[PDB]
Amino acid sequence: AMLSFERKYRVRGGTLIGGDLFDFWVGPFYVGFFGVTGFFFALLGVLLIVWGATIGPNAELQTYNIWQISIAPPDLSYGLGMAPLTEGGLWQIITICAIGAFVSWALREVEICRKLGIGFHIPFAFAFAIGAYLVLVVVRPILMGAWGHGFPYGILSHLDWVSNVGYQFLHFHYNPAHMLAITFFFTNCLALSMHGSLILSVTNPQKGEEVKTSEHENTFFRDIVGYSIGALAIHRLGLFLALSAVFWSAVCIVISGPFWTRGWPEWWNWWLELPLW
Amino acid sequence: MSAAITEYMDVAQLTIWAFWFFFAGLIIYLRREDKREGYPLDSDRTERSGGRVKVVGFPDLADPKTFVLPHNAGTVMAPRVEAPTSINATPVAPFPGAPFEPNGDPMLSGFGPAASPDRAKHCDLTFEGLPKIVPMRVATDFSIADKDPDPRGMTVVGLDGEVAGTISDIWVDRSEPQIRYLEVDVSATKKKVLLPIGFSRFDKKAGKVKVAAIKAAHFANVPALSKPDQITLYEEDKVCAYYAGGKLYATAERAGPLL
Amino acid sequence: MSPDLWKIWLLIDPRRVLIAVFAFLTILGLAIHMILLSTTEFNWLEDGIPAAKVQQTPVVPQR
Amino acid sequence: MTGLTEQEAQEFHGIFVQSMTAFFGIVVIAHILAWLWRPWL
Amino acid sequence: CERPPPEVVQKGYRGVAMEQNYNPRLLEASLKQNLPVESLPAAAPGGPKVSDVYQNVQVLKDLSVAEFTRTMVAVTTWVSPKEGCNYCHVPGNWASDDIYTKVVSRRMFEMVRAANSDWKQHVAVNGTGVTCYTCHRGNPVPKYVWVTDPGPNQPSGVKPTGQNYASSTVAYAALPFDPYTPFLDQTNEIRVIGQTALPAGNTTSLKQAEWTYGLMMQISDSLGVNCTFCHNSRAFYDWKQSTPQRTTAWYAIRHVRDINQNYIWPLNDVLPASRKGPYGDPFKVGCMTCHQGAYRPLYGAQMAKDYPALYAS
Amino acid sequence: PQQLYKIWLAFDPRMALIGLGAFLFALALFIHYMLLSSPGFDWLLGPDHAPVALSAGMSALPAGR
Amino acid sequence: PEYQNIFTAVQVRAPAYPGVPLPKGHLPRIGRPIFSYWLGKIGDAQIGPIYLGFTGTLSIIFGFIAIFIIGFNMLASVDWNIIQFVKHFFWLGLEPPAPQYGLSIPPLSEGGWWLMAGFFLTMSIILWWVRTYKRAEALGMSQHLSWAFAAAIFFYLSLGFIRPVMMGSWAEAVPFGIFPHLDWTAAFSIRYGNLYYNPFHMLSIAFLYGSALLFAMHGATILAVSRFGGDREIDQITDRGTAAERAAIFWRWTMGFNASMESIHRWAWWCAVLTVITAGIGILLTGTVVENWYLWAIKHGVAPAYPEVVTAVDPYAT
Amino acid sequence: MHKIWQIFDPRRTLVALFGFLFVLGLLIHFILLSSPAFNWLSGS
Ligand code: BCL
Ligand SMILES: CC[C@H]1c2cc3[nH]c4c(c3C)C(=O)[C@H](C(=O)OC)c4c3nc(cc4[nH]c(cc(n2)[C@@H]1C)c(C(C)=O)c4C)[C@@H](C)[C@@H]3CCC(=O)OC/C=C(\C)CCC[C@H](C)CCC[C@H](C)CCCC(C)C
Ligand SMILES: CC[C@H]1c2cc3[nH]c4c(c3C)C(=O)[C@H](C(=O)OC)c4c3nc(cc4[nH]c(cc(n2)[C@@H]1C)c(C(C)=O)c4C)[C@@H](C)[C@@H]3CCC(=O)OC/C=C(\C)CCC[C@H](C)CCC[C@H](C)CCCC(C)C
Ligand SMILES: CC(C)=CCC/C(C)=C/CC/C(C)=C\CC/C(C)=C\CC/C(C)=C/CC/C(C)=C\CC/C(C)=C/CC/C(C)=C/CC1=C(C)C(=O)c2ccccc2C1=O
Ligand SMILES: COC(C)(C)C/C=C/C(C)=C/C=C/C(C)=C/C=C/C(C)=C/C=C\C=C(C)\C=C\C=C(C)\C=C\C=C(C)\C=C\CC(C)(C)OC
Ligand code: HEC
Ligand SMILES: CCCCCCCCCCCCO[C@@H]1O[C@H](CO)[C@@H](O[C@H]2O[C@H](CO)[C@@H](O)[C@H](O)[C@H]2O)[C@H](O)[C@H]1O
């Protein structure tokens, strides 16, 4: 329900669509109009995933093992048209439901932060992950030419899809945007570990000692590496790294196939064929 | 000493089960740490039961943790008791989960986006015991960076682009050199009010400050300081909350909806 | 062009356009010379003209 | 809105029209030569 | 950089992503480089026999004179069109053998006739066949031969590694750049993956998987395909989940080993020194010598069926 | 429509011209790219586009299920 | 539009801050701090000073020797041609001894230099860990950072030292190079049957994605409430203001549960450390108790099954 | 007609147009170089 200091903040208004029709709370959650739409999109998507598991790929390979349940996209011979329900149209319906649910979630966040009077950084950051998913299942299939290029919905089968797509270019480590995205991911993990460690160390000092001040935080990292970035700038940098990783991963996957159809090492030939050497 | 314990079990399976047990323990620990602020919850279940059933969920709360503050400022318990308050609003509808209406004049109501708790009434201190946020009239060793506007004498305009005063002084932070506040000399009451940087946009071309939170006529109700050289944690929160309330209560079209 | 074209410099300062043009033509010339060096028709060093007078051992025909 | 006088717009418009006309004439001549070299339609 | 869309061929189950992608412009340019040659008209059947008008015929003993001269005319076009017939035959007569080209060609005839009769599980699935033009393409010396690569120069006291150097033989990766010698000439194990879930006496090192990877990069570059043309990448060892082309490749490796060990090496005495590598071995045959970047030589053009002198019987 | 000039009483023209120019340029780029992808309307291939014919039993693409 | 606090509009310059005084028996800090204007638009515009003790000097010496050996071998691999060194720089590497030596010492050109470089680099890393511990303890702070660094060092040593000794050969170790060590990463997966089916690999990937998600959420949250003074996290921890309350309430309304201003930094700490812990185990189980991860997953009913639409005849089974 | 520049600033539009024209020219030249039909360096 409510935290002991929450009742001051449950005010009316700030909705995008609906007004007073859906302006209420359900337990701890705020629903609104987009809450209703997103919840029922998610419910239908879940029920269709369960039915697709019930039907199975055949009558012999059907199983309720959670690692082995997979719902697959259509064939490449259907192009961008609509496939029969049992032959890959269920995947398309579930994809539409998932997109609807994600957009509803983002809009509900926008409503919540309008109500609380805070900035809009959080839905803005969520839009990057939504865009990466959309590149995975919408932009790349259209550029390639068929819905069959999307990945299957299964816990272990989409790993098989990733592996085979990676080996279609004979060596995926030599993709340059892939290297940039991996560098950003590793750097983000390092920065998060350091931020957590420093805050906990300052807040929980040695025994029989008082809480440390803001000067200690800067002095520590100036004495380790000779530079300190600050309290606000560490959060700036964390957001920047986490979003750059996703942006460059989307770039790396959208150029594989649509814009390059050979092995990835060969792409570096422009460097090796310069007249300098 | 081999890799097969039985006909079906092996080492790499026992290792994953041990990891799952450790992970369950870690999740319980983290959720218990999460519950040091705002619990036990305030719900209908407690008040119907006459203050008998306390809503904490699972897991329950931890034993109190002690923070000791520097310069003999005192001691604070991480899980503590706080006095229940009477809000300045009134429910829109009697069913549970209904919103509240900000009774009175919404800007001067202390409810909704214009709400804040009551923090300690003492100034934040440096490593030597000085006040932390002070105007540049006492932090004389500070200076404005080169090739920068120096926003003294800039006119401040309200939400509707109407001038509401001029900047008189800049409040900076001794421990970390950066600007935390602007001082506006309102030309409607002959008073001076503080303005957080997070609510002001620097138009460096024409030398202006844009305040999109409240209108020009609203600069006459900003909460004031006790002394003209330092600020306390209470007053800073009050000043920020007053401007935050304008993000919803400024105009008739800001309550929504679009359709 | 128009006789009154000289007013253009009342909008653009000489320094920031002189630097840009001088830093631009050099890059363009380098790029064109490299593009010509890349082709087999307009490479003046390896064209075989005039004659070779350089003897050109077992070879590796995989490369 | 832009803080320009009337003549500060008139002279700019006149010189802009003259320069753009000359620039377009150049590219028209270039495209005529290119078409006389190798048609692309 | 390239622009979409590509031409896609699906090979596996939907959602498994076993597909081939081609750039149509690159495909058209590659097609322009692999056209076949229109065959000669059929000979008049009958007349004098070969074994009664010629002396030093050894390989083509069971033909007719018209077919014999037609075959000679065709192989003049396939191998040495610029030089003509004096390239192989000493001027003055035709029965003399005092030149190395005639001996080499006599061995090459047997190699081709063996290829067209003994390895039909490789070169006769669709009846494409093998002719002299498959390798030479009108040149006396084929364009895609290999020798034992010495690699970049090293200091006198430094032991070479054979890797960590950019090379087109492994498609510009930092893998061992000479996979020909241990696999396509000698007979080393290509399999490195174990076939049990738990350890049982499989002590293959991690450095041998890189040699296998280099050979596979060379193979896929020679055929112009990717890995999923023959494999499912979640189990490279599993024949049950592979494609029918993997069996053809398995037989092709043995066919190339046979060609190198039994037809090319014994000729190392009579070939001139300009046909040998720095180690003293001649030019050898690989996957690139016939396919030249296509999944079939000449994309499967059938010109061997018109010449009955290229079959053992 | 008779009194359409009132539409400029609600929308600022200075932003409207920027938006219209940007949208029109984006639409033109998209349509040109779509034509460039299509196999019928591709002028970069040249007026004298002659694809390679297959003389014998040859196929440019391998077979697939 | 509204100020998003992504860049600093107006900067303020105060004199340099030497730092909190150190206790007796410490060397003075070296260097005089200077200010950078463009660096001040995103963070603090002050660089230096630094503290350099004895452990810090030893780390520098050991690490520079190791890096010099690596570079010298990369240069020798192209026969002292500096231009060819620049051309092939990303492809060059120094590589471990051959598999026919086991755990013995080969000649210099055949893996001795690799062993010496690895030893010196490991020594420098250990000394740097000791330096971080000492600097944490000199100011009266706790030792969370040294524990996280210890986890990273554990994964590094599993990757380079412990597993080769368990397998009994140096050829199982990773080379020193840009493209060479990516080749090693690919060959390791190929040799041991599709590392996607290693469950500790799955856990490690989950924790990496979780670290990215947690840092994005925390950064966006703190930037959203920074108009209330939310960036000063210590004050909010010791005296909860509107920033912490609004940050908690946003997430409680969004997903039903929330953390604290103090507690969230614990979620950050454990998520990153568990990324490398589960990594170090995942490769210690590979080749020692599991031979083929795909067959292991089939044995435990994890790998999915597909309809048989393409298949091949086995030439070893005729 | 001579009233656009009251709405649009001239100084920035000059540099914007100058940059846009050069970017477009470079793009068209690169595209033409990538087509074997219109390449003027190796086609002849
Ligand atoms: C053989 C295979 C190749 C390879 C082939 C590929 C292929 C193919 C891909 C990658 C992709 C990635 N690879 Mg790779 N990659 C390889 C080796 C690596 C190695 C390594 C150590 O070797 C690393 C670190 C990586 C790392 C990466 C990342 C850069 C990237 C994945 C992150 C991402 O896309 O976020 C994206 C994040 C999302 C999509 C999250 C979306 C979630 C949204 C918000 C939906 C909500 C979720 C859910 C419904 C909510 C409810 C759930 C519960 C009910 C609560 N690869 C090998 C060499 N790699 C992927 C990529 O770049 O994608 C853009 C990709 O497609
Ligand atoms: C872009 C930077 C990183 C990021 C940011 C980010 N994620 C976010 C947010 C932000 C800022 C939120 O505010 C939002 C949130 O609420 O967090 C608590 C969220 C969120 N990120 C989530 C997950 C998530 N983020 C990921 C990644 C990332 N998120 C990036 C690394 C991943 C990865 C890498 O895999 C996952 C799994 C959720 C916990 C949450 C959004 C919840 C949501 O959208 O709920 C609405 C939908 C449902 C409740 C049900 C959907 C119904 C569908 C039918 C489900 C199945 C769809 C699917 C296509 C089929 C199955 C797929 C198979 C692979 C199994
Ligand atoms: C929680 C797991 C994550 C993690 C954590 C982590 N890393 C850490 C720490 C922690 C907690 C530290 O405390 C420690 C540190 O100091 O952080 C600031 C560190 C660190 N993590 C580092 C790197 C690093 N971490 C990585 C990853 C990760 N670190 C994980 C994702 C990676 C990856 C993904 O590959 C790298 C590369 C270092 C920057 C630092 C530890 C540095 C160290 O120990 O160095 C010892 C050796 C030397 C200093 C040798 C120097 C010798 C000479 C100075 C060389 C002279 C030549 C010179 C290089 C020429 C070029 C010019 C120079 C001027 C640059
Ligand atoms: C038996 C039965 C009912 C079966 C049904 C099963 C079915 C069908 C389930 C499907 C239900 C579907 C499809 C939809 C329902 C959706 C509903 C109602 C609820 C789902 C909510 C949801 C998606 C929760 C996911 C949350 C998860 C898993 C991860 C979030 C990331 C994470 C680990 C967060 C933990 C740490 C937290 C709380 C961070 C937030 C947080 C941050 C980031 C701060 O910076 C901060 C700063 C200062 C103070 C506080 C905070 C703070 O709390
Ligand atoms: C101007 O610059 C000069 C020329 C001076 C120097 C320049 C050098 C350059 C350009 C260097 C470039 C280096 C690069 C690109 C390095 C890349 C390194 C990478 C990517 C490394 C990645 C992984 C390597 C790992 C994980 C190796 C780990 C090895 C370990 C942990 C081995 C430990 C071995 C031990 C402890 C062995 C002990 C055995 C004994 C003690 C007997 O050995 C003597
Ligand atoms: C079809 C029946 C023929 C004929 C008439 C010839 N060849 Fe080949 N050939 C191949 C290779 C790798 C070599 C060695 C490289 C070389 O020596 O140039 C040869 C060599 C010859 C020669 C000798 C040419 C010379 O250098 O003097 C001659 C005269 C010759 N061939 C004739 C490879 C192949 C093939 C690939 C497997 C095939 C098929 C053929 N050759 C077929 C023929
Ligand atoms: C984290 C929870 C862990 C719980 C279990 C703890 C005990 C773990 C013990 C296993 C450690 C690995 O133990 C190692 O296994 C391998 C593989 O079987 C054994 O190898 C041996 O048995 C295998 C299998 O029959 C045969 O190839 C041969 O007999 C021999 O090589 C080694 O002799 C043993 O040293």
Side-chain angles (χ1 to χ4, degrees), chain E residues 3-4 10 12 22 28 295 299-300, chain F residues 33 36 57-59 61 64-65:
Chain E
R3 49 170 179 97
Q10 182 187 7
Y22 297 90
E28 209 275 344
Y295 69 100
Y299 293 93
Chain F
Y33 206 79
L36 274 178
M58 31 185 297
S59 311
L61 295 99
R65 61 164 302 271

Side-chain angles (χ1 to χ4, degrees), chain E residues 32-283:
Chain E
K32 283 181 168 178
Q33 273 292 91
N34 301 308
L35 286 195
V37 183
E38 185 181 7
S39 302
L40 293 177
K49 293 289 300 186
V50 168
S51 57
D52 312 328
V53 80
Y54 297 148
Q55 282 82 339
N56 284 123
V57 165
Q58 300 179 357
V59 176
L60 316 170
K61 292 184 297 189
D62 300 318
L63 293 185
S64 181
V65 181
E67 194 63 53
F68 187 87
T69 181
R70 183 195 164 191
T71 300
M72 290 292 148
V73 170
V75 306
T76 298
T77 304
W78 291 336
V79 181
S80 70
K82 295 304 120 188
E83 296 79 11
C85 60
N86 294 325
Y87 188 60
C88 292
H89 281 282
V90 291
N93 75 330
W94 313 90
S96 177
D97 288 328
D98 318 324
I99 188 171
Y100 79 92
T101 42
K102 191 173 179 183
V103 181
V104 178
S105 51
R106 179 174 284 158
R107 201 72 170 102
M108 294 269 144
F109 269 114
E110 309 173 43
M111 181 185 62
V112 170
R113 305 215 308 173
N116 277 334
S117 288
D118 288 13
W119 293 96
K120 281 194 294 296
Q121 66 261 338
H122 174 211
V123 300
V125 175
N126 298 90
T128 304
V130 165
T131 176
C132 315
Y133 187 83
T134 306
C135 292
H136 288 275
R137 306 284 175 97
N139 289 122
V141 177
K143 196 182 176 179
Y144 286 108
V145 292
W146 65 266
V147 305
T148 298
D149 196 16
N153 308 76
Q154 310 290 347
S156 40
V158 171
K159 201 57 175 56
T161 70
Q163 55 171 344
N164 301 148
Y165 185 83
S167 187
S168 53
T169 64
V170 287
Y172 303 100
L175 295 166
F177 47 72
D178 188 2
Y180 310 91
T181 305
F183 300 119
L184 297 188
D185 190 19
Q186 297 173 2
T187 304
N188 287 339
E189 188 61 39
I190 302 178
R191 292 176 292 177
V192 298
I193 304 170
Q195 288 179 341
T196 58
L198 301 189
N202 187 35
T203 70
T204 300
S205 191
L206 195 57
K207 298 200 172 193
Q208 199 60 23
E210 313 236 35
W211 286 89
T212 294
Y213 206 159
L215 174 71
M216 291 301 138
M217 294 285 270
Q218 167 61 20
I219 285 177
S220 74
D221 200 14
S222 307
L223 265 62
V225 296
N226 61 62
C227 310
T228 65
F229 185 68
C230 300
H231 288 286
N232 190 334
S233 64
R234 80 167 181 168
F236 283 111
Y237 81 104
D238 195 9
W239 284 90
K240 189 177 171 186
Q241 293 177 84
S242 299
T243 70
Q245 277 78 45
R246 201 183 168 188
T247 320
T248 308
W250 193 94
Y251 279 102
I253 298 178
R254 279 75 187 165
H255 186 196
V256 175
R257 283 177 191 169
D258 179 72
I259 289 183
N260 276 326
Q261 285 288 154
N262 291 321
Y263 290 99
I264 303 291
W265 260 106
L267 295 175
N268 197 21
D269 300 0
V270 300
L271 287 174
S274 59
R275 312 281 182 252
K276 310 178 193 308
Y279 288 102
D281 53 330
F283 298 162

Side-chain angles (χ1 to χ4, degrees), chain C residues 46-60:
Chain C
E46 304 168 4
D47 53 357
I49 308 286
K53 85 178 189 166
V54 176
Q55 304 312 129
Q56 182 60 31
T57 169
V59 303
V60 178

Side-chain angles (χ1 to χ4, degrees), chain A residues 29 39 42 46 105, chain G residues 213-214 217-218 221 244 247-248 251 255 257-261 264 267:
Chain A
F29 298 92
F39 174 77
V46 156
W105 189 274
Chain G
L213 161 72
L214 277 190
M217 281 165 64
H218 185 53
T221 292
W251 293 110
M255 59 172 171
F257 68 105
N258 59 94
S260 191
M261 179 65 75
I264 182 65
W267 286 89

Side-chain angles (χ1 to χ4, degrees), chain B residues 201-223:
Chain B
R201 166 69 78 172
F202 284 97
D203 194 356
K204 298 182 178 182
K205 320 295 293 193
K208 273 184 169 176
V209 174
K210 307 176 183 181
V211 183
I214 65 181
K215 305 202 309 297
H218 286 167
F219 282 89
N221 292 325
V222 183

